[PDB]
Design a protein around this ligand. Structure first.
Ligand code: ATP
Ligand code: MG
Ligand code: MG
Lengths: 209, 248, 230, 239, 73, 48, 251, 97, 105, 248
């Protein structure tokens, strides 16, 4: 739904020190390296300018919800404890900002969700009407279409499309004219590129409906 | 006032415990649900202690190599003998200090290897003096029953969610620099929180003043708060109800 | 995880395999059912994977007696078992009492059938939830069973995929008093919320309850009903 | 991810179950493909044979199986599970005539087959028969029909039918094939039933490598084609 | 399997390993300085590091079947 | 990684136990409490 | 013959003609996925793309960049572009895209995103989105159990193609290549080899012509008689049948 | 044996030697004559020797908390509560009888 | 009170007259309160396009957003498709005006 | 561990599967019966009172069972319908045999022997259902009984359910009456106890349920009293709060 693009759009028109970190390279082996990489970010951040710390995904480790009576799950659990200690531990105030992005947010820790730590909650819908028009306009604005084939016949369609797959449609019809040696889209291929990417039903075995 | 009895009183007046004839306490545990003032009380003491304050977060005692991930804890507390009155603080012992599990390729040895040194530099062959520890975390039943013994920690202090009389006083502190107009009742707004955390009273105070920012306004009405109550307070929203009625 | 099985508890909560059986219910085809003032309307979603599948072969709205119908959201192969169970069970009331069985009485007994496969262990529970309708003694009824064995009495509900969008639709939609003809109008309008692209006379399949008995609609009316009525 | 239910038949956390859907890839060790086509008042089965030995016979190879005098079928999947599936089909077709006094419909028989395959999924402790079955038959006031039964207990009747290894390639050909409104006059049926299998497998077979079962409104008896007239339809499409 | 570190350790063994790899590709395969190697476990060795013109011929030694036991005894 | 340097000493013990240049008159006695967890390279007769 | 050219102009036309990528405007065509057997296909038809210009090649082992913290790996991206900047479209040959030391299973033990920490950053930062001068990448591997569902967008694996192992007639093509610089009489019925051959692997039919020379070392054949190839099939193809672990499929 | 020849159990105390624990830890404190040591011993039968030192220090803090030097029974009533509330509620319900 | 659909009328009609008296930010706040009120009604089968026109009006009064306000005018015309013709014919006047002002004539 | 089937003791007498079922009922509904001379009552709680249900039965927690007895229920609903159809079928077997109603104790022990028998036999489950008993007999009059998953039981004069409402038992002792046990004195006690335990304030009538049983002319009528007279019972207690603050 256009999540990381919004983080990239902030990095242009800011005067900050933008720091993006994937939430996967600290869930690794070598017990103790995980929580120290959290310290390596913030000591690099708080020594520097007003900065933005964009953690890409924590749909991975973000949830306690049980006491781990096992091995190597308390190491999973304690990275959150290190994350909480240098988020809303001491004051640590001056000009540090943290942005996170996930899937469904009911899974994760309620200790994260108190305000003062994660004050803002923003939900993303998909491509509803009047927003399919705006994304079709802007992508085809910087694209020589040059036909009398109206695109709004695909605005008014059902089969709701994620915002990344709109980008796939206009680029596929770009391939589906140039590969056939056309210096302009003729938009008889635009039907076929639409029907191509919409077929993600796969198999489902015609079973359990 | 209980923290004055264990930290201020032995440092300021040690001769009282001489005349009364008891040993002096040194162990403090702070517990409760999240967002109930556990870390201000560390910083409020540290602003007024007139003493050495040693901050240790509870997760850097593992490093990466065995044996040196432990011994600096022994080098930590022996450095506190240099500044002979001192207060050492623990951040969030839901890490190291949890439980002695089994052997095998499960649990962890090295977490226990560090924990046994914490278990012993304050209760070993040599008893220390003028060094006091404060530990603060939730999850009371899952830290180990060898540092919870009252030879180690003498004061266990809860932090319940505040009362309606107490939610009013928290609301007055953060709305102090906030500028309210007139005709506004904080007690009505304090009754709109059926069991708030107390830390989320700030989230009401920030989001109510945020409504005036998008209006290019400095005036804050009571309507700004009542919209901010429904924004901050949420629910789990347990859907499909089949889980509920399997479990009636 | 503890689970792995059905004949033991977890140390903290409840039976986990029954909760996993409800996950197959949510991954099924969507469905809707609305109880109006004079009847109950059932409507479901039915799309083939290809243009080759004959749509008039296997049906979704399935009558039990001449005044009782039934739909589902789950797996169709498990659905055909308890339908054939509910047919023969409904005749056993009629051989004893010589009277058509009330709709509150099957749901006592059909849920006790789905009860029995949650026992033993060497067996699996169903992966099907149901919706049962009927107009007995003037007032119509609309119930819902589950693989755990409980049951309900709904005004309006929706199962299958994207049921939370249909529920917040119907929470904003369903009033107390409408006729059956207005009830089908808001029953297709909630099927259009989560359906796929084309919606023809063969993509949906709708049955109703009058006081004149149970009836499922032929596609001649359903084409004429979906013809520009929203 | 899997783990949880990949040995026995129980549920997976939120998803489905794997032992039944491992039987769907248990057809593909046969190394075979079958095609059924219903266009108009007739019905055609076509399936190739694969004879890897000269000492191996010819008559004991055919997968076309006569269930009743008006109902024939074809079997895919592994061989030994296929024939025991046919023994139940021959058995319960005769119980209908005994209990009820008339010829069983082709629609009613796949209900009785898939319900037996249903219990083996619901109740455990029997391997669920990794084979697939396709039926044809003539019904009064309904025309000819083509049905498919699945190892999961699913069934659905449909016009153009593929099975075996190459469903997704043959059905992709037949979707583009059955979209124009051409009539199907009993040789339009067969020639499309040949050339679909002939291009998807890419064999354009020699005459002695297949089988063709047929049924037609005129003579409703199930009929296996003679090798001579198989050559007659093969020289018909390539004029 | 070579692994990265920060305290030397193995960070001379690859300089001994690659010198074996550089010399073996250093000369053309003209049979006169044929090289024989033998290990007990294959799963330690670097398979993509041999594979073409390095140590290449696989001579496995299976266990004696029946009569090969009776021969050795 | 792990017990790398221990393996180099342990495999050097093996090649001066059997291999080229057999030792002759050198008798080796070993004793353990946990014999299950030993290397099959030492379990071969000719070495033990 | 179908795959010499299907891969050719899907690489040639975007690099030769970037001006059509402003006549409609998209920079994105970043190469095919060559998946199938090991065979000879991964190494030999990469040299078939080398037929016009091409050259570059270099090598991608798919292992020296896959180090865990990707602050080094992003420098290891641009370290290889220190020579790819020295030219026109350089053609980064990339071997074993999906292969780690050992095997790769699903997300259990170390069979994890160690590729995809690097891999999703490559198609971001190597070429396409972050690019320099229409350099072309050619993905080629045969193992891959775990993959990106976002890899199937136009711009990472724009079109995919599968390599098959048998033909029974491209045997005879590859056979006469390997029955080339070996001394004989011209006595050979090469199709009599092929009908008696059951190898089903192009790299292993290379082994068949090797062992027929070993039968020529036997019995002092400075030539190679037609029997030596029939001797070679019975030795080589029987040795292929006596190996386990026969489950491999690229996704 | 050969390495360690003695294995020594240290069990939790009794109702007899527990008197000696309370006697020694109340050596040099001003003890009012209202108290009975056997009140807290006999009524509750579970608690360690390190518990008893915490009770004696807490009851001394209660005297300064309400402006006293001597220590009465009401100090030990509040101290025996406050020390022991760190160990959970119970095990099983009345199955056994 | 408890009735809801009359609130959406009086919130939108005030957002007309605050804009008619040339008060821009107060008409913004009255429109925003009309949006969050209009999220809980069975159907605004015609009032949606009435709401979506003046979403475009106040957004055009910024003289800053000449693309999304065009989308609000166009959605208002689609709601006015042959079921309210006098309000439909004025919808072309605003959406062509927004396309002139976007310098794409 | 020892979390296998229920046919295996732990190292020391601690049947873990029985203990897991006896803790499961705390996360369920809330039921209580009170003392009464010349009567008895039950009180229950309406869970998940969402506005798209019918309640066609108008009796969900309460099941009238023979003629002069009813029962509450708390636990797994799948096992709840099995027991009630079994328990009604016990009382008619006794009535066919002696032509006299079942005397309210050996009905309970007949179920408790069934509920026990699933703890010794096979790899299945115990019943995860505890439930109450109200009734009248010739020998002792009005009675109360308390079922358990283990098959243990016991008579009571006032009782409730655990981890949901275990604090109500402290209130029942603090506001205990003995002798002055009329029905109106007990209904006022019932709405006060459900006020604190049900944490939703002001106690809407659609969240509760009250069922009584009296003795009138030798008939023993059973009342599930309607929602109209719940209203004037709640507002009576709401009036008593405004009267109780006169001491303040
Ligand atoms: N009683 C209070 N008065 C004023 N502010 C409070 C109060 N309680 C909490 N806060 C606010 O909560 C924040 C501090 O969090 P706190 O000290 O509760 O740590 P904590 O939330 O207990 O730690 P954790 O997040 O690990 O639970 C500060 O913003 C502080 O202003
Ligand atoms: Mg993203
Ligand atoms: Mg804190």
């Amino acid at each position: 739904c256009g999540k990381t693009m919004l983080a990239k759009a902030v990095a242009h028109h800011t005067t900050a020190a933008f720091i993006r970190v994937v939430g996967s390279e600290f869930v690794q082996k070598y017990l103790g390296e995980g929580p120290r990489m959290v310290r390596d970010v913030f000591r690099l951040a708080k020594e520097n300018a007003p900065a933005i710390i964009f953690i890409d995904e924590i749909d991975a480790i973000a949830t306690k919800r049980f006491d781990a009576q096992t091995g190597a799950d308390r190491e999973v659990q304690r990275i959150l404890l290190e994350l909480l200690n240098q988020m809303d531990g001491f004051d640590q105030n001056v000009n540090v900002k943290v942005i996170m992005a996930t899937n469904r947010a009911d899974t994760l820790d309620p200790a994260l969700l108190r305000p003062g730590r994660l004050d803002r909650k923003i939900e993303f819908p998909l491509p509803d009407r009047r927003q399919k028009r705006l994304i079709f306009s802007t992508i085809t604005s910087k694209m020589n279409l040059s036909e009398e084939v109206d695109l709004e016949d695909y605005v008014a369609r059902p089969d709701k499309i994620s915002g990344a797959d709109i980008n796939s449609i206009c680029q596929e019809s770009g391939m589906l004219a140039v590969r056939e040696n056309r210096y302009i889209v003729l938009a008889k291929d635009f039907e076929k590129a639409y029907k191509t990417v919409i077929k993600k039903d796969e198999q489902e075995h015609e079973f359990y409906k | 006032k209980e923290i004055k009895e264990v930290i201020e009183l032995p440092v300021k007046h040690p001769e009282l415990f001489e005349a009364l004839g008891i040993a002096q306490p040194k162990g403090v545990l702070l517990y409760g649900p999240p967002g109930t003032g556990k870390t201000l009380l560390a910083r409020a003491v540290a602003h007024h202690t007139d003493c050495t304050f040693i901050r240790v977060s509870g997760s850097e005692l593992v490093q990466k190599f065995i044996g040196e991930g432990a011994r600096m804890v022994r080098e930590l507390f022996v450095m506190a003998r240099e500044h002979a009155p001192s207060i050492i603080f623990m951040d969030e012992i839901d890490s190291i200090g949890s439980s002695r599990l089994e052997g095998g390729s499960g649990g962890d040895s090295e977490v226990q290897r560090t924990m046994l040194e914490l278990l012993n530099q304050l209760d070993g062959f040599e008893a220390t003096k003028n060094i006091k520890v404060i530990m603060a975390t939730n999850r009371i039943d899952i830290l180990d029953s060898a540092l919870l013994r009252p030879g180690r920690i003498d004061r266990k202090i809860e932090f319940p969610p505040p009362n309606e009389e107490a939610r009013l006083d928290i609301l007055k502190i953060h709305s102090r620099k906030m500028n309210l107009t007139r005709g506004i009742n904080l007690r009505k707004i304090a009754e709109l929180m059926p069991g708030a955390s107390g830390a989320e009273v700030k989230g009401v105070c920030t989001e109510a003043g945020m409504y005036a920012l998008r209006e290019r306004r400095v005036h804050v009405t009571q309507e700004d708060f009542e919209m901010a109550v429904a924004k901050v307070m949420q629910k789990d929203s347990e859907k499909n109800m089949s889980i509920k009625k399997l479990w009636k | 995880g503890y689970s792995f099985s059905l004949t033991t508890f977890s140390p903290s909560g409840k039976l986990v395999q029954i909760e996993y059986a409800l996950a197959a219910v949510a991954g099924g085809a969507p469905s809707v059912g609305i109880k109006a003032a004079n009847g109950v309307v059932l409507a479901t979603e039915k799309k083939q994977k290809s243009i080759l599948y004959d749509e008039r072969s296997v049906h979704k709205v399935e009558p039990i007696t001449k005044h009782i119908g039934l739909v589902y959201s789950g797996m169709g192969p498990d659905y055909r078992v308890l339908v054939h169970r509910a047919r023969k069970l409904a005749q056993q009331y009629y051989l004893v009492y010589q009277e058509p069985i009330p709709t509150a009485q099957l749901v006592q007994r059909v849920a006790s059938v789905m009860q029995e496969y949650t026992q033993s262990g060497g067996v699996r529970p169903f992966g099907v939830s149901l919706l049962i309708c009927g107009w007995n003694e003037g007032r119509p009824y609309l119930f819902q069973s589950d693989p755990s064995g409980a049951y309900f009495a709904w005004k309006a509900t929706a199962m299958g995929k994207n049921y939370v969008n249909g529920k917040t639709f119907l929470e904003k939609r369903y009033n107390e008093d409408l006729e059956l003809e207005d009830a089908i109008h808001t029953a297709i309008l909630t099927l259009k919320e989560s359906f796929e692209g084309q919606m023809t006379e063969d993509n949906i399949e709708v049955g109703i309850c009058n006081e004149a008995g149970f009836r499922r609609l032929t596609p001649t009316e359903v084409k004429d009903y979906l013809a520009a009525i929203a | 991810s899997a783990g949880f239910d990949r040995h026995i038949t129980i549920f997976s956390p939120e998803g489905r179950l794997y032992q039944v859907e491992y039987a769907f890839k248990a057809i593909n060790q046969g190394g075979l493909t079958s095609v059924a086509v219903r266009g108009k008042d007739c019905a055609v089965i076509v399936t190739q044979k694969k004879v890897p030995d000269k000492l191996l016979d010819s008559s004991t190879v055919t997968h076309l199986f006569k269930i009743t005098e008006n109902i024939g079928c074809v079997m895919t999947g592994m061989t030994a599970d296929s024939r025991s599936q046919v023994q139940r089909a021959r058995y319960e077709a005769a119980n209908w005539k005994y209990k009820y006094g008339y010829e069983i419909p082709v629609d009613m028989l796949c209900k009785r087959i898939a319900d037996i395959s249903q219990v083996y999924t619901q109740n455990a402790e029997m391997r669920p028969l990794g084979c697939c079955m396709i039926l044809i038959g003539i019904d009064e006031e309904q025309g000819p029909q083509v049905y498919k039964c699945d190892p999961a207990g699913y069934y659905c009747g449909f016009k153009a039918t593929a099975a075996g290894v190459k469903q997704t390639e043959s059905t992709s050909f037949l979707e583009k094939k059955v979209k124009k409104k051409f009539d199907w006059t009993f040789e339009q049926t067969v020639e499309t039933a040949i050339t679909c299998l002939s291009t998807v497998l890419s064999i354009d077979f020699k005459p002695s490598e297949i089988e063709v079962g047929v049924v037609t409104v005129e003579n409703p008896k199930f009929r296996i084609l003679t090798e001579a007239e198989i050559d007659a339809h093969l020289v018909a499409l390539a004029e | 399997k070579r692994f990265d570190s920060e305290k030397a350790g193995d960070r001379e063994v690859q300089r001994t390993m690659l010198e074996l790899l550089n010399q073996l590709d250093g000369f053309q395969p003209n049979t006169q300085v044929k090289v024989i190697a033998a290990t007990n476990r294959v799963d330690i060795l670097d398979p993509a590091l041999l594979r073409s013109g390095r140590l290449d011929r696989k001579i496995e030694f299976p266990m004696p079947n029946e009569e090969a036991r009776a021969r050795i005894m | 990684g792990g017990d790398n340097e221990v393996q180099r000493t342990m495999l050097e013990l093996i090649n001066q136990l059997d291999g080229f240049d057999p030792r002759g008159n050198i008798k080796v006695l070993m004793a353990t409490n946990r014999p299950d967890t030993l290397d099959p390279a030492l379990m071969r007769p000719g070495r033990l | 013959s179908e795959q010499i050219r299907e891969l050719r102009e899907v690489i040639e036309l975007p690099l030769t003609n970037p001006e059509l990528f402003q006549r409609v405007g998209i920079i994105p065509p970043k190469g095919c996925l060559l998946y199938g057997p090991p065979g000879t296909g991964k190494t030999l038809l990469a040299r078939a793309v080398a037929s016009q210009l091409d050259c570059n090649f270099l090598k991608v082992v798919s292992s020296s960049i896959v180090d865990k913290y990707i602050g080094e790996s992003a420098r290891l991206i641009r370290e290889m572009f220190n020579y790819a900047r020295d030219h026109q479209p350089c053609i980064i040959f990339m071997d074993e895209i999906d292969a780690i030391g050992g095997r790769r299973f699903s997300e259990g033990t170390s069979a994890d995103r160690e590729i995809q920490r690097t891999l999703m950053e490559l198609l971001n930062q190597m070429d396409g989105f972050d690019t320099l001068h229409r350099v072309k990448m050619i993905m080629a591997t045969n193992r891959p159990d775990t993959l990106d569902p976002a890899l199937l967008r136009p711009g990472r694996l724009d079109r995919k193609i599968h390599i098959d192992l048998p033909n029974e007639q491209a045997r005879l093509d590859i056979l006469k290549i390997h029955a080339g610089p070996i001394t004989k009489h011209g006595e050979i019925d090469y199709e009599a080899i092929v009908k008696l051959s059951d190898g089903f692997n192009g790299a292993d039919l290379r082994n068949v012509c090797t062992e027929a020379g070993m039968f020529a070392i036997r019995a002092d054949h400075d030539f190679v008689v037609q029997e030596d190839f029939m001797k070679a099939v019975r030795k080589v193809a029987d040795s292929k049948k006596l190996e386990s672990k026969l489950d491999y499929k690229p996704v | 044996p050969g390495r360690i020849d003695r294995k020594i159990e240290f069990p939790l105390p009794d109702e007899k030697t527990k008197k000696r624990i309370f006697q020694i830890h109340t050596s040099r404190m001003t003890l009012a004559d209202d108290v009975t040591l056997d009140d807290l011993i006999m009524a509750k039968d579970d608690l360690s020797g390190a518990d008893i030192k915490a009770i004696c220090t807490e009851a001394g803090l209660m005297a300064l908390r309400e402006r006293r030097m001597k220590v009465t029974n009401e100090d030990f009533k509040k101290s025996k509560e406050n020390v022991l509330y760190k160990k959970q509620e119970g095990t099983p319900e009345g199955l056994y009888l | 009170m408890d009735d809801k659909a009359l609130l959406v009328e009086v919130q939108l009609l005030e957002s007309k007259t605050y804009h008619a008296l040339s008060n821009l930010p107060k008409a913004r706040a009255a429109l925003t309160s009309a949006r969050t009120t209009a999220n809980a009604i069975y159907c605004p089968p015609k009032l949606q396009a009435t709401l979506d026109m003046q979403s475009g009006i106040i957004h055009a009064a910024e003289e800053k957003d000449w693309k999304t306000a065009y989308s609000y005018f166009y959605e208002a015309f689609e709601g006015y498709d042959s079921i309210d013709s006098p309000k439909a014919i004025t919808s072309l006047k605003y959406m062509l005006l927004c396309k002139i002002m976007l310098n794409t004539p | 561990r020892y979390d296998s089937r229920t046919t295996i003791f732990s190292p020391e007498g601690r049947l873990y599967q029985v203990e897991y079922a006896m803790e499961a009922i705390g996360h369920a509904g809330t039921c209580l019966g009170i003392l009464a001379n010349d009567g008895v009552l039950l009180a229950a709680e309406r869970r998940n009172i969402h506005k798209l249900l019918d309640e066609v039965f108008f009796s969900e927690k309460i099941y009238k069972l023979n003629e002069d007895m009813a029962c509450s229920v708390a636990g797994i609903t799948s096992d709840a319908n099995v027991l009630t159809n079994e328990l009604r079928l016990i009382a008619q077997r006794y009535l066919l045999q002696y032509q006299e109603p079942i005397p309210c104790e050996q009905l309970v022990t007949a179920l408790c022997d069934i509920k026990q028998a699933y703890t010794q036999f096979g790899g299945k489950r115990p019943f995860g259902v505890s439930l109450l008993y109200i009734g009248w007999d010739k020998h002792y009059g009005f009675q109360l009984y308390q079922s358990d998953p283990s098959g243990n039981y016991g008579g009571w004069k006032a009782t409730c359910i655990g981890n949901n409402s275990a604090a109500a038992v402290s209130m029942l002792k603090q506001d205990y009456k003995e002798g002055e046990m009329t029905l109106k004195s007990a209904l006022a006690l019932a709405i006060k106890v459900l006020n604190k335990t049900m944490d939703v304030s002001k106690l809407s009538a659609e969240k509760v349920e009250i069922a009584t049983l009296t003795r009138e002319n030798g008939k023993t009528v059973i009342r599930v009293l309607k929602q109209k007279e719940v209203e004037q019972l709640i507002k009576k207690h709401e009036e008593e709060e405004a009267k109780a603050e006169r001491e303040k």
